[PDB]
């Protein structure tokens, strides 16, 4: 239980210290600070396919899955965490059939990511700054 | 991979001389009151560390567990290294600091041709901007290996760099702040008891 | 193409068209009309290599396609610099498509939903719903469509009288099917007209003769065969023959023939319906 | 309008810097910009998914297609198998008329240049001058600011001197009146030779050199890939030829004499 404990999390970009996850009308984004319920995040792992589960604290029987338009959102009916530095993950993709293991990115714009969708793009390596996040135990 | 706890303790590991080649019991240990030992790993503190060390299917093996100081009833956790964390053979990671300058670290320097292992990290927040680090042993010479740590579950390891001599190195690398290495030291030349290293970050 | 009006069509859906809806101000697939609101000015911007698409809106001209961030929702909105707005072309020269891409996020582009009829943004794939045709409004006008011209001051005169005779004058509106006229489109760049009811029957001016024209069959290569239509309000236009770069009234009338008076330079027209 | 013609690939980037295949091993790079068959390209479209290829044109290997290996982030080509990662999808940016150039496997990649270690990623789509490139003709792209004019050997041409203008057949002298820059203009899409404007077909050959004239205008179509022609555009039925083809010191340049000889062919060098 050392490696993500499950509970309360903040998840926020590497690019603002200000920016927390917020799912609006379906679509998450990083909003200000607002001391709300919709910022906050609950962690599970479970075993049954050995993988972790982002869902909403204000929105309860929602876990953060895939569409296929390329971008994220949270469903009520699996993700593969890398951590590469301190405070710094990378949710991987679980299927890697017949393509590659595709990860959560984010488009900025000389350090700029105000009202940015996350997509899922495909990924290689680490290197890539406009990848990972930032979970916070709150 | 063998710890205990949160490393509060350090840990020896020690493999009987002649065991294996006598009664067996699949799945069961058969002890055959053997008391020669042959030392592999381990330090005499209170350090932070972990060993990772190749153990073979046949040898029986003791543990040395130093005399505890707070009964906060302590735990030994062996887990099978399946993954990348099989260049760190017969060694013990020592978890280590905090802003810049020269910081020295001390510990029992092993034989020659073995394996100690320091893990550390790099002060400062969020790719991001790099810091200078150099690192030179005082007394002993030894070859050193970098690496960068990655926690996937189990700890992928990737190389950046090799084949660096120690014992007053002028060279310099640059390092992401923020982030956790491994440095693999082999001692090439024993000229001291203790082996005694410095960081320094810029 | 700076500062051009075109029209955008799903390539999956020939028969689906961008339109505006009134009032509201969100944009949707909808069938083949003939009304401003299916018409769209790109706009070049060499400052950051942009494309900005206006409306031809009459009511509010100043509506432009905004994304609406982070929201899947594209609709009409002001123009205030900013970058949710702007759009960036490729042209596949493969296949003539046209793919539309969110200037903000490079990787999302336009995505039709013909099940919920929309434009959403999706990432970009092997697929015929993210592809679009754009084309100038007047080529995909009259590309292929049975309409009917009419004259100015005159709601109740059409162009038309028989089958034996090949003679084209002014008439009253009936429905007929002599009457109405099939505009047809590539490699000459030119219009050609038919006859609904005269089959094989195509435009025809007589080099020879004056002012008067007729009705014939194909002649393969020739001048006097196919026509120009040119843009002048925004629904009027100017037929004119290509061996000079035009069609006028009679001066003052049931029974007159329009024949062809003078060059560019009255003279105009209006498109209806049958 | 692109189908089985020879294509040259250049980096915003980097005006110089042009697509090279380095013989022996399959590696494309950014090796300056050279001239030859190694930087030469070919389109072909597959009338079956709307995609198309690049064909490397070499003369020891010509099924060198560009391919794309597992996604490990290179590019490196093989051989030809027609497979889906095979072909290559090509977008026109009508905005700045730039290309980009897409996998068929998957559009969300596109060609990237780090001009760091000459090389080329496949990354996803950015706003930086990297992502795109420039698809040009391998007779208009060297042809813009090349410089030896010969027939079918080491001779080449010189406008007599300076005080007068004609032309003559020498060796190479190192003279700077021997240098004819080969410029295109994209006005009218045609050729212009100066020295340090052809006008001609103005008293039967009257070759010189002298506008918005249509006799200075001239035209380069290949026949060897190496050997080429100049046509004049007014009149387009006559060809840069020689009076009678002997390779003397001395020989004044003719026009017409559209049979195709080896004295109406021309090879353009670096010098």
Request: proline share 0%; aromatic share 0%.
């Given at each position: 239980r050392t490696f993500l404990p499950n509970g309360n999390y903040n998840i926020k970009s590497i690019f603002s210290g200000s920016l927390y996850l917020s799912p609006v009308s379906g679509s998450l984004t990083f909003s200000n600070?607002?001391?709300?319920?919709?910022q906050k995040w609950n962690v599970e792992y479970m075993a049954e396919n050995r993988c972790f589960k982002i869902s909403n604290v204000a929105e309860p029987n929602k876990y953060l899955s895939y569409d296929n338009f390329g971008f994220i959102s949270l469903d009520s009916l699996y993700w593969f965490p890398i951590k590469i530095a301190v405070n710094t993950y990378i949710m991987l993709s679980l299927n890697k059939v017949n393509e590659l293991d595709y990860a959560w990115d984010i488009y900025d714009t000389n350090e700029n990511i105000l009202s940015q969708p996350l997509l899922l793009l495909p990924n290689f390596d680490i290197y890539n700054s406009n990848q990972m996040f930032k979970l916070e135990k709150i | 991979k063998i710890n205990a706890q949160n490393n509060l303790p350090s840990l020896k590991i020690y493999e009987a001389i002649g065991s294996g080649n006598r009664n067996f019991q699949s799945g069961n240990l058969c002890d055959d009151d053997i008391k020669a030992i042959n030392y592999i790993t381990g330090f005499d503190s209170n350090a932070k560390s972990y060993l990772v060390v190749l153990l073979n299917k046949d040898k029986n093996y003791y543990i040395r567990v130093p005399q505890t100081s707070s009964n906060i009833e302590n735990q030994i956790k062996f887990k099978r290294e399946e993954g990348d964390l099989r260049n760190l053979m017969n060694s013990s990671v020592n978890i280590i600091l905090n802003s810049t300058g020269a910081h020295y670290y001390t510990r029992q320097s092993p034989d020659v041709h073995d394996y100690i292992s320091y893990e550390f990290t790099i002060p400062g927040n969020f790719n991001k901007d790099t810091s200078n680090i150099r690192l030179y042993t005082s007394y002993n010479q030894g070859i050193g290996t970098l690496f960068r740590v990655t926690e996937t579950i189990g700890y992928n390891l990737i190389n950046i760099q090799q084949n660096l001599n120690l014992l007053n190195s002028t060279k310099s690398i640059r390092l992401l702040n923020g982030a956790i290495y491994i440095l693999k030291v082999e001692v090439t030349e024993l000229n001291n008891y203790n082996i005694k290293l410095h960081i320094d970050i810029t | 193409l700076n500062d051009k009006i075109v029209t955008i069509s799903c390539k999956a859906n020939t028969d689906l068209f961008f339109y505006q809806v009134p009032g509201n101000g969100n944009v949707s697939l909808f069938q083949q009309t003939r009304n401003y609101l299916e018409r769209w000015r790109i706009i070049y911007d060499s400052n950051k290599a942009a494309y900005k698409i206006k409306s031809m809106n009459i009511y509010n001209t100043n509506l432009v396609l905004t994304w609406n961030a982070p929201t899947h929702n594209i609709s009409a909105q002001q123009d205030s610099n900013a970058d949710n707005q702007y759009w960036l072309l490729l042209k596949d020269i493969g296949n003539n498509s046209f793919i539309i891409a969110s200037y903000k996020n490079p990787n999302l582009v336009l995505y039709a939903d013909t099940v919920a009829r929309n434009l959403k943004l999706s990432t970009l794939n092997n697929s015929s719903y993210i592809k679009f045709i754009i084309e100038d409004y007047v080529i995909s006008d009259f590309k292929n469509f049975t309409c009917r011209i009419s004259p100015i001051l005159a709601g109740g005169k059409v162009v038309q009288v028989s089958m034996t005779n090949l003679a084209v004058n002014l008439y009253i509106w009936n429905n007929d099917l002599n009457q109405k006229w099939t505009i047809i489109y590539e490699e000459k760049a030119a219009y050609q007209f038919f006859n609904k009811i005269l089959s094989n029957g195509v435009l025809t001016w007589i080099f020879s003769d004056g002012n008067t024209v007729r009705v014939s069959s194909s002649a393969q290569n020739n001048d006097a065969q196919y026509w120009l239509i040119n843009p002048v309000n925004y629904d009027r236009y100017t037929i004119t023959n290509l061996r000079d770069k035009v069609l006028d009234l009679y001066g003052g009338a049931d029974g007159t023939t329009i024949q062809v008076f003078n060059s560019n330079g009255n003279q105009i027209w209006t498109m209806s319906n049958p």
């Open positions: 600070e607002s001391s709300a319920n919709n | - | -």
